[PDB]
Symmetry: C2
Subunit: 206 residues, 2 copies
């Protein structure tokens, strides 16, 4: 009976990857959602003054990628070989690079920053989507199973589907010229235990 | 036996982590260093149109973190448990975040960008250094062995020491108020097989 505790804000964000893995493993966990004033208090207790943080029997582990990979390994969603695991990693890092590109837009659209959406939508969110999707679609075309790597689900499938689904709420024309990316989103999120989680989880705007 | 090929520019950069792991494993590998005109040719052949790329018996793997983690796992420099491996990951991601903070400065100082070094040194590099070093020193103070995690060498030890050593060539006052960070740099780079590599490797500006 390993006790898991996830500590993050009351949003999906960077904590969601972990949350979805737990659901797929049918694994109980303490889903702690902090607000700003509460986060400020525990801030110095965290390894890098940041959330999400996972605790496994009290042992702290920060960083969403490291967290989601860890659980993914623990419950068989990391990859079927050490090499495939690395390829999963490579996509997750590319996704991260892509999120750094569209930061500014992302923080401005949800309402955490000053800016013009139509400018940032035009000049930064695109081309960044195109570049990233270009690579994503390549990986899909050589997957017969529909998954990003291998003939099975891995934690990057979750990151990309979730992000795309979330972007659609802000950008309805996201995925319009990329059908392979859409069939992916739907495929992953239609998986029974994930579908169920998506329907029962707390409803938040990102 | 396993044929390894690393393809990167003629610099340490994001390819070095891998190069150092090979040295520590006493592992032969094809250290391919491209120039611009050569990179442009193979660019579309790469998973994300980018280097470094590792090939393991022909199987392509992009992204420096994924690459260095993969080899690190191969040769026992990833961590002694799946949890420790995750903590190593968390530091490597923090390092990456930190590199995004200091990017503008880094690209200006080596000569890939317009800017004022003294401005970027003062307002973006040094604060970022303090924040990051603050976390790095915390991890060291609770390590009796001197290593960042565990009682043994892992691939983050390499990333951090190498980066610090490289920064010193541009910023001589880089580790002046952080003695624990210096003892770390020296400790890692003094390890026989790494020391040897540092002395024999091609000399590049970064």
């Amino acid at each position: 009976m390993v006790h898991y505790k996830l500590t993050y804000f009351a949003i999906r964000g960077a904590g969601e990857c972990a949350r979805q893995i737990f659901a797929l493993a049918d694994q109980e966990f303490e889903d702690v959602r902090l607000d700003k004033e509460q986060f400020a208090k525990v801030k110095p207790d965290l390894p890098f003054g940041q959330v999400p943080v996972l605790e496994v029997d009290g042992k702290q582990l920060a960083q969403s990628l490291a967290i989601c990979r860890y659980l993914a390994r623990q419950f068989g969603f990391a990859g079927k070989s050490t090499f495939d695991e690395a390829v999963v990693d490579s996509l997750a890092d590319q996704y991260s690079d892509y999120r750094v590109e569209i930061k500014s837009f992302f923080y401005t659209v949800i309402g955490m920053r000053e800016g013009d959406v139509e400018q940032l939508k035009k000049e930064v969110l695109l081309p960044a989507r195109d570049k990233f999707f270009g690579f994503i679609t390549k990986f899909l075309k050589k997957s017969p199973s529909g998954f990003l790597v291998g003939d099975s689900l891995t934690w990057v499938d979750l990151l990309v589907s979730e992000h795309n689904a979330t972007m659609l709420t802000f950008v309805p024309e996201f995925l319009e010229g990329y059908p392979e990316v859409k069939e992916h989103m739907e495929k992953i999120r239609a998986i029974p235990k994930l579908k169920k989680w998506i329907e029962t989880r707390p409803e938040t705007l990102f």
